[PDB]
Amino acid sequence: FQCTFVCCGKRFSLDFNLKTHVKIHTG
Numbered sequence: 509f510q511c512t513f514v515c516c517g518k519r520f521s522l523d524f525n526l527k528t529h530v531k532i533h534t535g
């Protein structure tokens with residue numbers, strides 16, 4: 509998918525990698 513939080517704005521590939529990442533912006 510894609511990130512859009514803070515200055516991280518990283519890149520997401522799929523749902524698994526989607527939450528496995530944004531999980532921080534969420535905690």
Ligand SMILES: [Zn+2]
Nearest residue numbers: 511516517518
């Ligand atoms: Zn991010």
